[PDB]
């Protein structure tokens, strides 16, 4: 009963994150060294615009190549000193050698908003692509409501 | 199960709402055909539960991903998906189940006339895939 309910909710969450994995899988193939050239930046923005406008549960989509050429939709002003290559989303993607990762919750550099990030290094290793979801919007992924006892799993 | 289905359909409505804005008389020019195909390729590759995405302008210029061979005499403007969209004046429609002209597969179609009325865009889901 109560366990049936929590498992529906847990399925709604992992389905949502699994759909984001389909986004990073596509961009992992499409994003190449060639696409990271400055003259091609409008192509990345156009594809990110499409992705965001059809996925109304998404906070943002962004990529960096290995040189820190960073593209985000929406195109917010990033803080002075922002370095995508030094963020854990980027490092964890590179660590997983092209396998998709789902991060712990953290606050964005851009707005200090609490998000989960689905992130993946590109097939050719030229970059990392990432999709943010606000915790608030969300409510294999590794996320689940689980019975606890003084915050201890049972 | 009614929730699983309607969640799926509403997501497809977000797709038709985007393409209803982006598809214009200008985008239906032959010089922009690659742009439609590229955006449809992106949409399909992200949305694993989708059978196809297609559009026709008012002149029957038809673009489908995947690009299946359509039957001889196929006329998108005489299909109910197209007529129902035009009837609903740019408000999104979900059809009753029907068998596709392309493969005789049972689908439901989410369909929408473009903002400028130059065309209709549509997304098929297999009944099989819904259940």
Residue at token pair 């060639």 = A34
- Residue A34 DSSP one-character state: T
Give the method of determination.
X-ray
- Decide: residue A65, CB within 10 A, 0-12 exposed, 13-18 middle, 19+ buried: buried
- Residue B86 DSSP one-character state: H
The shortest CB-CB distance from B42 to any of A19, A26, A56 is to: A26
> By three-state DSSP, how is residue B53 classified?
strand
| Dihedral sign from CA coordinates of B104, B46, B57, B95 | positive
Contact B14 A47 (CB under 8 A): no
Question: For chain B, how big is the Rg over CA atoms in Å?
Answer: 14
CA pair distance A123, A27, nearest whole angstrom: 9
Q: φ, ψ for residue A122 (rounded to 5)?
A: -65, 155
CA pair distance B113, A102, nearest whole angstrom: 37
Q: φ, ψ for residue A71 (rounded to 5)?
A: -130, 130
Contact between residue A20 and residue A131 where contact means Cβ atoms under 8 Å apart = yes
Determine the residue of chain B that is closest to A56 in CA distance: B14
User: Which chain A residues in 23-52 lie under 8 Å from chain B, judged by CB atoms?
Assistant: 23, 26, 30, 47, 50-51
Judged by a CB distance cut-off of 8 A, whether residue A3 touches chain B is no
| Chain A interface disruption, residue of B22, B23, B40, B42, most A CBs within 10 A | B42
CATH number at residue A121: 3.30.450.20
Residues of A within 8 A of B15 (CB-CB) are 54
For chain B, the domain total comes to 1
Q: Which candidate, B57, B64, B37, places its Cα nearest to that of B124?
A: B64
The 3-state secondary structure of A78-134 reads CCCCCCHHHCHHHHHHHHCCCCCEECCCEECCCCCCEEEEEEEECCCCCEEEEEEEE
CA pair distance B40, B23, nearest whole angstrom: 11
The residues pairing with A115 across neighbouring beta strands, listed in sequence order, are A106, A134
The shortest CB-CB distance from A56 to any of B14, B39, B47 is to: B14
In chain B, alpha helices (H): 2-22, 33-46, 80-87, 127-130
Domain range for A51 is 2-153
> By three-state DSSP, how is residue A43 classified?
helix
Q: Which candidate, A58, A108, A61, places its Cα nearest to that of A88?
A: A108
């Amino acid at each position: 009963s109560a366990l049936d309910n929590v498992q529906q909710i847990n399925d709604m969450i992992n389905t949502s994150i699994s759909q984001k994995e389909d986004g990073t899988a596509y961009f992992s193939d499409w994003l190449t060294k060639d696409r990271y050239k400055p003259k091609n930046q409008s192509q990345i923005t156009d594809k990110f615009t499409e992705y965001m406008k059809i996925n109304k549960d998404v906070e943002s989509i962004y990529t960096s190549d290995t040189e820190g050429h960073f593209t985000r939709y929406p195109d917010l002003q990033m803080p002075k000193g922002y370095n995508p290559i030094e963020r854990d989303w980027y490092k964890k993607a590179v660590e997983n050698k092209g396998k998709v990762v789902v991060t712990d919750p953290y606050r964005t550099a851009s707005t200090n908003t609490m998000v989960v990030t689905v992130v993946q290094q590109t097939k050719d290793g030229s970059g990392v692509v990432a999709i943010n979801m606000k915790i608030d919007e969300l409510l294999k992924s590794g996320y689940a409501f689980i019975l606890t006892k003084d915050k201890k799993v049972v």
